[PDB]
Design a protein around this ligand. Structure first.
Ligand SMILES: Nc1nc2c(ncn2[C@@H]2O[C@H](COP(=O)(O)OP(=O)(O)O)[C@@H](O)[C@H]2O)c(=O)[nH]1
Ligand SMILES: Nc1nc2c(ncn2[C@@H]2O[C@H](COP(=O)(O)OP(=O)(O)O)[C@@H](O)[C@H]2O)c(=O)[nH]1
Lengths: 168, 168
């Protein structure tokens, strides 16, 4: 019964960087003698075993058949833009709308993430993003994989959102 | 109407290299005024529009929730090992068995691919792989992304296998 987390957003916003850094600080080896080699790696976030996937829509993924499958399988979504990329922020709404459509749900656990908050070349203000998150009813947090600001908190917040959804 | 191709195999066998090289030689821009920016990139193989996905089970993908979803969505599978990696050849059968189980089908279009055939350090003989492919009833081809040997033929053969399956 793992929690299934999906990281979504425009190309180049830092989805891989965020996910790698999370794994780096939260993976453990678990003994499980029912599997071939007797040990498996898992990620534990806020007490929950989590699966992690990245949904990219550009580049090689312009050729993928899997977008809607990622949206159906994911239980909560980190919706990532970069604070120095206005287009990436503008693209968020499309992602959120597609997820809601594919999941046929108005209550999907989500956290809005403004990554690269170490950069001095900001074009998306914290207030713009907070306003967006408030409209959606979801948390917003700024992150940087360079300084580590916010990264753990973004994923832990998403886990708490999934947990509250599952307890409904 | 798109043919959905999935490249599967152990980490490091060359799945990304094969897929990138295929895209490089077969992508086209298509005019489509129904979509946002009026042009979309597509891959055309043997006259068919194809979608391309890579199923990796190790590394970051040890944490993925999506393996069975890739297997359900894919219509044909390139099962890739490397000719200098005996373990990757040994791992093929497990992949094939899982695909058949998930798809609940004895007739799944597949091609067996022995990649890195430019390398002089061979530990998997062509006969070993041909014997495996014959048992499965599927084509086998050796490829190299370094010399380009076989790469186009592997994907074109898979498209023909899917086509014949769809005409049944
Ligand atoms: N300054 C800065 N660069 C970052 C940060 N996170 C990622 N990057 C860089 O942004 C680029 C894109 O990151 P990547 O993880 O590949 O993005 P993805 O395409 O969304 O997976 C890379 O060069 C990363 O080094 C961050 O918090 N700050
Ligand atoms: N010599 C040789 N190396 C290859 C070939 N295809 C891929 N490689 C290398 O093998 C490594 C793994 O390739 P990659 O595509 O990342 O494998 P994947 O993990 O299966 O996606 C990389 O260093 C590639 O450069 C090939 O045909 N010949």
């Amino acid at each position: 019964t793992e929690y299934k987390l999906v990281v979504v957003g425009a190309g180049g916003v830092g989805k891989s960087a965020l996910t790698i850094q999370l794994i780096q600080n939260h993976f453990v080896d678990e003994y499980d003698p029912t599997i071939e080699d007797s040990y498996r790696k898992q990620v534990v976030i806020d007490g929950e075993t989590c699966l992690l996937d990245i949904l990219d829509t550009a580049g090689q993924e312009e050729y993928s058949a899997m977008r809607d499958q990622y949206m159906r399988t994911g239980e909560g979504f980190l919706c990532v833009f970069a604070i120095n990329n206005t287009k990436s922020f503008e693209d968020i709404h499309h992602y959120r709308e597609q997820i809601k459509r594919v999941k046929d749900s108005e209550d999907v656990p989500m956290v809005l993430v403004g990554n690269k908050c170490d950069l001095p070349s900001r074009t998306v203000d914290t207030k713009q993003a907070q306003d967006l998150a408030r409209s959606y009813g979801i948390p917003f947090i700024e992150t940087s994989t360079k300084t580590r600001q916010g990264v753990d908190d973004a994923f832990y917040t998403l886990v708490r959102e999934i947990r509250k959804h599952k307890e409904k």
